[PDB]
Amino acid sequence: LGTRAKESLDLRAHLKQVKKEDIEKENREVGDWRKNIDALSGMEGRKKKFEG
Amino acid sequence: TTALVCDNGSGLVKAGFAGDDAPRAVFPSIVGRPRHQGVMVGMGQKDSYVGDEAQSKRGILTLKYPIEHGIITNWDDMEKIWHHTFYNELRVAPEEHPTLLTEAPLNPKANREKMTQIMFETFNVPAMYVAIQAVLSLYASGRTTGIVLDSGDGVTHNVPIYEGYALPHAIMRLDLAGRDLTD
Numbered sequence: 603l604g605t606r607a608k609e610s611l612d613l614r615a616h617l618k619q620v621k622k623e624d625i626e627k628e629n630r631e632v633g634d635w636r637k638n639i640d641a642l643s644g645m646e647g648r649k650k651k652f653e654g
Numbered sequence: 655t656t657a658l659v660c661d662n663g664s665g666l667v668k669a670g671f672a673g674d675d676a677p678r679a680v681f682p683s684i685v686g687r688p689r690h691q692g693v694m695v696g697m698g699q700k701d702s703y704v705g706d707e708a709q710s711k712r713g714i715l716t717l718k719y720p721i722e723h724g725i726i727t728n729w730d731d732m733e734k735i736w737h738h739t740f741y742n743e744l745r746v747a748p749e750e751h752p753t754l755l756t757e758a759p760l761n762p763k764a765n766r767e768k769m770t771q772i773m774f775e776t777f778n779v780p781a782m783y784v785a786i787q788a789v790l791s792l793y794a795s796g797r798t799t800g801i802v803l804d805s806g807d808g809v810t811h812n813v814p815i816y817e818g819y820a821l822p823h824a825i826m827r828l829d830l831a832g833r834d835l836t837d
């Protein structure tokens with residue numbers, strides 16, 4: 603009984619390792635970028651050129 | 655060289671060199687022959703006063719607009735108006751200047767073809783281009799989308815534009831304009 607139980611335990615151990623430890627390879631992607639504001643400072647242009 | 659941005663319109667001809675803020679010369683587009691007899695000799699009476707001159711002698715003239723609803727109905731008078739615009743209100747010979755006329759949407763083809771034929775044969779310009787009157791009004795607003803309602807004096811047309819791609823199936827041209835309101 604112990605042998606059969608430990609067989610399944612060891613079999614699932616490696617699967618759990620691969621599933622979980624490999625998550626630590628990267629988890630910062632949740633972090634978003636700046637997305638800064640202007641605060642009425644980027645108003646320094648007239649209606650001179652618009653195509654470029 | 656510089657380009658001539660003429661804009662025939664219907665009711666006021668607006669013209670001027672490209673790159674400025676306002677048209678150089680704005681004057682009504684009417685050509686009026688005198689109708690009475692005339693007794694003073696040597697007064698120097700001409701046979702047709704065009705432009706803003708016929709808005710001062712209008713007491714003895716019969717003013718008649720050469721453009722009815724966008725389309726041009728009297729080609730000789732329109733040629734006279736263009737000749738006046740080039741030579742007396744701007745004083746630049748057309749042999750050395752590109753021209754950019756404007757035309758309402760959904761107008762007859764023959765009108766546009768005759769316009770280009772006149773500009774190339776009579777005035778002999780180097781190069782001319784015809785543009786739809788609503789896209790320009792969208793340029794001036796500094797936008798690139800939007801639906802523009804250009805209620806002129808001849809014809810009211812409503813051209814929708816998105817991201818620079820005009821929608822040709824959604825142009826609604828209606829012939830009520832300032833002239834009908836005057837009447």
Ligand SMILES: Nc1ncnc2c1ncn2[C@@H]1O[C@H](COP(=O)(O)OP(=O)(O)O)[C@@H](O)[C@H]1O
Pocket residue numbers: 662663664665666667805806807808832833836
């Ligand atoms: N300040 C104003 N108030 C009301 N109506 C005006 C005014 N100025 C012009 N209009 C009307 O608009 C007409 C001029 O329209 P305009 O834009 O010159 O036509 P076009 O597209 O042919 O140039 C005039 O006939 C007049 O009836």
Ligand SMILES: [Mg+2]
Pocket residue numbers: 663664787804806807
């Ligand atoms: Mg107009």
